[PDB]
Design an enzyme around this catalytic site. Structure first.
Site, short mmCIF file in Angstrom:
data_model
loop_
_atom_site.label_atom_id
_atom_site.label_comp_id
_atom_site.label_asym_id
_atom_site.label_seq_id
_atom_site.Cartn_x
_atom_site.Cartn_y
_atom_site.Cartn_z
N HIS D 53 0.95 -1.11 0.07
CA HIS D 53 -0.02 0.05 0.16
C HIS D 53 0.92 1.29 0.09
CE1 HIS D 53 -2.13 -3.00 2.43
NE2 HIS D 53 -3.37 -2.44 2.01
N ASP D 56 2.46 1.76 3.23
CA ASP D 56 3.54 1.00 3.91
C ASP D 56 4.95 1.39 3.44
OD1 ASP D 56 1.47 -1.07 4.51
OD2 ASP D 56 1.44 -2.08 2.49
N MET D 87 2.34 -5.76 -8.27
CA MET D 87 0.87 -4.84 -7.69
C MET D 87 1.16 -4.12 -6.58
SD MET D 87 -1.49 -5.25 -4.98
CE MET D 87 -1.53 -6.99 -4.07
N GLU D 180 -10.71 -6.31 -4.40
CA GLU D 180 -10.60 -7.63 -3.71
C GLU D 180 -11.87 -7.70 -2.65
OE1 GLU D 180 -6.83 -7.62 -1.72
OE2 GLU D 180 -7.48 -9.00 -0.24
N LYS D 182 -14.49 -8.92 0.30
CA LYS D 182 -14.42 -9.39 1.89
C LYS D 182 -15.86 -9.00 2.37
CE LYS D 182 -11.97 -9.25 6.11
NZ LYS D 182 -10.96 -8.26 6.95
N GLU D 216 -9.39 -13.36 -2.35
CA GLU D 216 -8.67 -13.87 -1.35
C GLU D 216 -9.40 -15.05 -0.35
OE1 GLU D 216 -6.77 -10.99 1.89
OE2 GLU D 216 -7.54 -12.44 3.46
N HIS D 219 -11.36 -14.69 2.69
CA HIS D 219 -12.45 -13.76 2.63
C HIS D 219 -13.56 -14.41 2.06
CE1 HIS D 219 -9.80 -10.02 2.51
NE2 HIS D 219 -9.61 -10.71 3.69
N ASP D 244 -5.02 -13.92 -4.04
CA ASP D 244 -4.54 -13.67 -2.50
C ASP D 244 -4.63 -15.13 -1.87
OD1 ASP D 244 -3.87 -10.65 -2.13
OD2 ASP D 244 -5.22 -11.02 -0.32
N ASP D 254 -11.19 -12.47 10.48
CA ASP D 254 -10.13 -12.59 9.23
C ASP D 254 -8.87 -13.07 9.76
OD1 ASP D 254 -9.07 -12.62 6.30
OD2 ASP D 254 -8.48 -10.31 6.68
N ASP D 256 -6.15 -14.53 8.23
CA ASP D 256 -4.96 -14.33 7.40
C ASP D 256 -3.78 -15.65 7.77
OD1 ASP D 256 -6.22 -12.39 6.07
OD2 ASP D 256 -5.06 -10.91 6.77
N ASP D 286 -1.19 -13.13 1.29
CA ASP D 286 -1.62 -11.75 2.18
C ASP D 286 -2.08 -12.66 3.36
OD1 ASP D 286 -2.63 -9.61 3.51
OD2 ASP D 286 -4.64 -9.61 2.24
C1 MQD Z 1 -4.58 -5.29 -0.73
C2 MQD Z 1 -5.47 -5.27 0.91
O1 MQD Z 1 -5.58 -3.75 1.14
C3 MQD Z 1 -4.66 -5.78 1.91
C4 MQD Z 1 -5.30 -6.09 3.11
C5 MQD Z 1 -5.29 -4.83 4.13
O2 MQD Z 1 -4.59 -7.34 3.70
C6 MQD Z 1 -6.60 -6.58 2.76
O3 MQD Z 1 -7.01 -7.89 2.28
MG MG Z 2 -6.03 -9.75 0.68
MN MN Z 3 -7.81 -11.27 5.00
#
Ligand code: MQD
Ligand code: MG
Ligand code: MN
Ligand code: MQD
Ligand code: MQD
Ligand code: MQD
Ligand code: MG
Ligand code: MG
Ligand code: MG
Ligand code: MN
Ligand code: MN
Ligand code: MN
Lengths: 387, 387, 386, 386
Positions: D53, D56, D87, D180, D182, D216, D219, D244, D254, D256, D286
């Site tokens: 992002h 980041d 990406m 993406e 969610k 993802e 999600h 993802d 979530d 992850d 992710d």
């Molecule tokens: C690209 C997206 O912003 C990444 C996150 C924050 O992990 C949500 O899935």
């Molecule tokens: Mg993601």
């Molecule tokens: Mn997630």
């Protein structure tokens, strides 16, 4: 109207209206509240009291001098407003040392520190008049199967609860413990994930009478379970020591909506059961004003918790007092549900030909239960179409 | 290879491989199986035994003459094949008289008939050698809040279980009861919906030692709970009397997939725990071959249940015997989890400055748990990348 | 008094009040109903019409002579009562031949039969005046990963819906199709599991304008989704051809409770959205009177569905008309939500220093949304506590 | 040995290995990572690249001079290691200004700022070589029904994506967008909650060809859906622009988890489908190394993601190449699923008595599908038990 007063025994966590709005994906949206402010505002809205984690009232790492002033100011606010402190708890989940648990951390030095931090706050809780000491083991559990041997962790959880019962009885305190179940979040899976698992765990403690449950509406709903039915089993066991009220929309992250939001019909049957059973403890809200709100919206949401309890109290009372509902309960055989099945005993049942050899199973199966008409009278009462 | 034999103690319900495939939205896709056929085919596949509901072996409403011949043929098949009958149960859910429950039906005449039907089948179960008698209260519960007062229904459930314990001890039978929890389906919400709720209910029966649980993989997963953690608490309580193995893909209708299907990593940690704990009861499958299958596919699915148990048994054993895993368990402090927190006692803990005043919370928080490397060694073992 | 009349356009599936109460764990608790009785009893309660699968009205395997008798009696009851038949559908899920699907069965012979059985009932649906023909692909999907190659299955599903579009246009019929999504049950996973995946699939059909959705409350809730949100995206796409009303308590088997039971707040936001958007189709209930009930309980549950919709309609209209709510909607910027972000265009937005270089992110972040006050006004309106 | 190389196209978000472990109930357990360190450590593990992002790589509120330094150091580490940046995305969810959304915030000023912040990062994404620009509208949605009129919000969301398409085409960039989905968290309900509703919304954009999805694992599983089924419909629509990868254990927050954790059978059917369909995009993780871990645990979890994909790739390829599996696929009619239902056309099907009048429904219903044998071969292949 539905105006709360202190006699309704509504209470709120300092961390509730004080939630700064930091979520998994976002920074705080409100400044921190001084506990003095929260006590006074809640009393203006009709609350009876507040509850606290140790670290909500005394910043972690405070010197003794800072601790004394924080407590002085809090007690000052309580005394100026008439608010009480019925319940307290320990934060065994925010500091990174608790990242694999407090009482069930794999590191034995962490388990010992968790108990020392708890005992220090039990002394303060009793000084402030609390009758219930809650434990929410939010970090007890795992994300993977090798990381936690559950029978070892249950042995360590029982060890810790039995040491805390030794401390309270050694000191002659009247306070009792209440375990607050949650099925997941922040760990992948949390130990004692439901009211039933905590009720069963208490029967293996050395003095089960010292411990009950503090069920939370949203946490049983996180497992898709019926919160009124869970509270009915905790009452049947004699273990509803405290209760936490909020809303939740199904099976997802813990939302902590204000009470009445989420599953409104479950909040109706919850208040129906609490009032029919004569539950006399705090009506405690553990809710987060959404982070979209500013402080005005914090207070509006806290007000709404109480308002919705009072509305639903009215409607459940009207449903149970309505003679047409009482006639429908009889047509549904709720009165036969409350009669013993076989107070005549085993031998009389075995000898009763009306119970098997001459039982007309087809005539009994043809009898409708009449449940849908009963439940539509309940819906009419909730929506105020009946009175 | 993974070839089962009777010593692996795999058992199957007659209703499992005999499921005709009638679902909520569809007619049967297979003809009914005679129990003789099922016993012989399962023995050819390496099973140890079978289990039954009363109505699976004796059609409902049979004359005594028909009953005798049905039982004769079943016992004949068992004797010809060497199969055993370790567990039996009562159908208190198919006949329309049970539409609002058996032991907790609002109609008291139905509750009495449910107990008479149960007691008649306990006598047959003991004649056939069963050691466990399961009760699955699939019709106990409700779709609406007025229809069932849960504290009254728990009183009626405890009444019925205590009468059945009076009957078994009066007759001098060794059989014990096992309650099989399910959270919903066919009722909206079922009473005692999880292992924890049934464990807590048993502590309120007059003789708790006569009753345990028969947890089913898919039914705890219907509530989103961790089945290995639930079985760990049932073992810790000394109440794992029997267990039901199948698969389930999350939170949805009860799928009853063959064991290993659904959540494969949970089936690995389940077999790891059963074998590490030394569980010595039946490995019983309560599964439905999907209705897409013909009879060949019924037997393939039953074979797969056993095969997958044996594969996962191998892999869990290899994981626990692998020295690199044992080193990783130490790096994760699983050995400190198994040491008492404070065998020195309460006063020694309060006096121990290493537990609070001189505890370096920051150094303890900096210690990684090393859980991810441990869990990747577990994954490598499940997939056979390690041995 | 909340008394329904035919003008409220409430309709019921023959299979809803006629459900005999057989479930996967239990036998029927009620005798089967004659469709003529259902039509007469529902008209007495205030309904507008009924809907049917082919096999509800004509028993599977009936002779042509039997078929004509069943249809003639049904049409005479419609005529006597004034009831309509707005929607019909095919049963491509009860008979064991459909155990792996109708239009997506791996057997090609079964796919061809599924289309023949549907086309036969489209004819009858148009003869009875239906405007919408629903497809529920309840056996389209799988329990295991290798059983169904989903790209192939979606090719088959598109082929089937394109053939059915060819048939209705070839015949000059005005009837349109509506796909009813469900995420699972009776298959482990069903294809086109939500309103989103049904809307996306219709855009790949040869003539997307002939197809919409028939979303069901309980089915989106079986995936945990927000039913009013999904109906808003269906309306935004211009594809809400029909709707199926009932209740569900969360993520579990499909309950098909009467409307207003299950998630009562989501029922209130659904009725608010349907009446605000001017939805003009049938208000169709796809519900099961629980098997605990006798025939009097069946008609009480059907009456309840209509009663609940009319109470919630009153309450949502009072919410939206209350000046204090309209003020709260402004306080929460619901009127700014409805204004275009950048009608000025891309270059104007890039050149606008108020949108970046001089935007005071902290002032804007301090602005409360005032959504809790708003929502408590909505709760007070729903509960009649103003 | 399952050792990854850059040719496997595994990529990671800076925010994944750099997650400091702050959750709603707890403080960070790890210090922040310099993006240069992440790029060097991931290259040592065999990764192909990283994603980011805007906030980041460049701390929110950085001066232009600070921004240029942060970017210069990052590009020097990419150059030194050979790592790519396939990406990028915008953070429209951390800062409190986005508490009611970015592109769908009720405040119009905030919608305009969200688009400015995104366009600024699209420029940087193209300078670093990205081919895909992801949008995750994690604050688009609501906790309560009156707070967000979803038809209005979808108009706003379409306006935003159309402006961004206007910008990329106006500049001559080749970068494409991927939404993406969610279903919830951090909002009570998030708009465009699944791959289905994102695919359906893209068909209403002015130039749908510029937009796809970035589904993802976790999600879709948060709605209980079948992730391989949703990726099959994305591939069937020609919209799988990026993917993802992670794990999730069912319907909850979530998680992850690293890829291969959570639902391991669905991970095997996903890798089977990605490699059968020839997906050629990044295999992007992710994921969050759990907060129990120290920095050595972070790199072990990242290594695990790639290891698991390579094991599952081996196993799915062995399944599909085994003659006994190919025979079982025929026994289950997977080859008939791939044949057109009615290439003969509508009239031929109507005239075909084998499809209705002479179709033996009972013979066809008696045919077993043989899906359990098939699935047990797949299990034996996944577990290396053949
Ligand atoms: C690209 C997206 O912003 C990444 C996150 C924050 O992990 C949500 O899935
Ligand atoms: Mg993601
Ligand atoms: Mn997630
Ligand atoms: C008392 C308990 O710690 C309060 C929490 C943090 O909200 C858990 O529900
Ligand atoms: C023993 C029990 O009755 C078996 C069922 C019906 O499969 C419930 O799981
Ligand atoms: C029209 C559809 O077939 C009706 C069902 C069977 O109730 C599924 O929702
Ligand atoms: Mg709480
Ligand atoms: Mg079972
Ligand atoms: Mg429907
Ligand atoms: Mn909570
Ligand atoms: Mn089951
Ligand atoms: Mn339904």
């Amino acid at each position: 109207n539905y105006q709360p007063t202190p006699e309704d025994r509504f209470t709120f966590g300092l961390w509730t209206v004080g939630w700064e709005g930091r979520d998994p994906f976002g920074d705080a949206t409100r400044r921190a509240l001084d506990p003095v402010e929260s006590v006074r505002r809640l009393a203006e809205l009709g609350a009876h009291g507040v509850t606290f984690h140790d670290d909500d009232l005394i910043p972690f790492g405070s010197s003794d001098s800072e601790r004394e002033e924080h407590v002085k100011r809090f007690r000052q606010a309580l005394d100026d407003t008439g608010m009480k402190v019925p319940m307290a708890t320990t934060n065994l989940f925010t500091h990174p040392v608790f990242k694999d648990g407090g009482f069930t951390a794999n590191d034995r030095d962490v388990r010992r520190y968790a108990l020392r931090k708890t005992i220090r706050n039990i002394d303060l809780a009793v000084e402030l008049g609390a009758e219930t000491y809650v434990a929410w083991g939010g970090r007890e559990g795992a994300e993977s199967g090798g990381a936690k041997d559950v029978r070892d962790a249950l042995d360590r959880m029982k060890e810790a609860f039995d040491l805390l019962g030794e401390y309270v009885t050694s000191q002659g305190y009247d306070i009792r413990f209440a375990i607050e179940p949650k099925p997941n979040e922040p760990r992948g899976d949390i130990l004692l994930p439901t009211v039933g698992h905590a009720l069963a765990f208490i029967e293996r403690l050395e003095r089960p009478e010292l411990y009950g449950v503090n069920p939370e509406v949203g946490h049983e709903q996180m497992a898709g379970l019926n919160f009124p039915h869970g509270i009915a089993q905790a009452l049947w066991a004699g273990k509803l020591f405290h209760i936490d009220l909020n809303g939740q929309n199904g099976i997802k992250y813990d939302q902590d909506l204000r009470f009445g939001a989420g599953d409104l019909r479950a909040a109706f049957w919850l208040v129906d059961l609490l009032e029919s059973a004569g539950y006399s403890g705090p009506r405690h809200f553990d809710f987060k004003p959404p982070r979209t709100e500013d402080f005005d919206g914090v207070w509006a949401s806290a007000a709404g918790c109480m308002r919705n309890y009072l509305i639903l109290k009215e409607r459940a009372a009207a449903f149970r007092a309505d003679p047409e509902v009482q006639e429908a309960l009889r047509a549904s055989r709720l009165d036969e549900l409350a009669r013993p099945t076989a107070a005549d005993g085993l031998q009389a049942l075995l000898d009763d030909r009306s119970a098997f050899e001459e039982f007309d199973v087809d005539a009994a199966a043809a009898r409708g239960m009449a449940f849908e008409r009963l439940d539509q009278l309940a819906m009419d009462h909730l929506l105020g179409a009946r009175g």
